[PDB]
């Protein structure tokens, strides 16, 4: 199988460990982990294009969009490859992530290993906000934490 | 992939920025950058296997060796893929990086993207130290700083 781990770190109390798993070259990737230091509610969850940490989470660039599409939901027809939707944090700010996506990959041209996974400040409207920013970032807000996706054991 | 990036950080004072450029899929990778906070002398510079920073640079794993060989220099036949050799820091502790390695690669079977780049405490004997650790890590010492090699623009 193929595994991957991401160490989410930020300037504030936002930090978490996100794990990935793909048992086949075309199989769905299982995203699970726990993030702390988040406001109670929904938070953006997207994989950005570049695995750059030279200027914090800003150097990661926009969302992973190899097909040159518009931002949307994970189960929507129009979406970026790195669009994973929202992650919900409880009252204690703990976000026990559990996402099963069939669009992202751990090997190939649309692979996410070597890029940046980012948890955002606000919620993702999944490209339904009605503005231009909904079809680019989903109005998810600023980047609280980020980390370079890497190969794990 | 033709460009990569790796931000070096640790629990101590060592920190730096390393860039990778591989214009040809079968050409050498230009590794250049600058690291600071080191001791004046030679320090280990190897690419480890796992891009795992959950437990620090310890979870990074051993040196990247997909051919199952022994530790050596960068211009040696018997060497791990990540065995880039040593780096020299000046009297102020700044080590200007400039390595051209054809064994590593930004794509393919020898892909270092998604793995980690680890700097070390002491010098690397290139497998000629005289002990058992010489053929594994080269007596490079503790991992001072590490980071996941990410895709760059
Ligand atoms: Cu090493
Ligand atoms: Zn998007
Ligand atoms: Zn080695």
Author numbering:
A (entry chain B), B (entry chain A): 1 to 153
From the paper:
Eukaryotic Cu, Zn-superoxide dismutase (SOD1) is primarily responsible for cytotoxic filament formation in amyotrophic lateral sclerosis (ALS) neurons.
The wild-type SOD1 structure was determined at 2.7 Å resolution, which contained twelve molecules and two partial models in the asymmetric unit. The twelve SOD1 protomers were organized in a honeycomb arrangement with a large space, as previously observed. Interestingly, the partial and indeterminate models occupied the large space between the honeycomb arrangement with the highly diffused 2Fo-Fc electron density maps, reflecting the structural flexibility of SOD1. Thus, our findings showed that both the wild-type SOD1 protein is dimeric regardless of disulfide bond between Cys57 and Cys146, unlike the monomeric C57D/C146D mutant SOD1 protein.
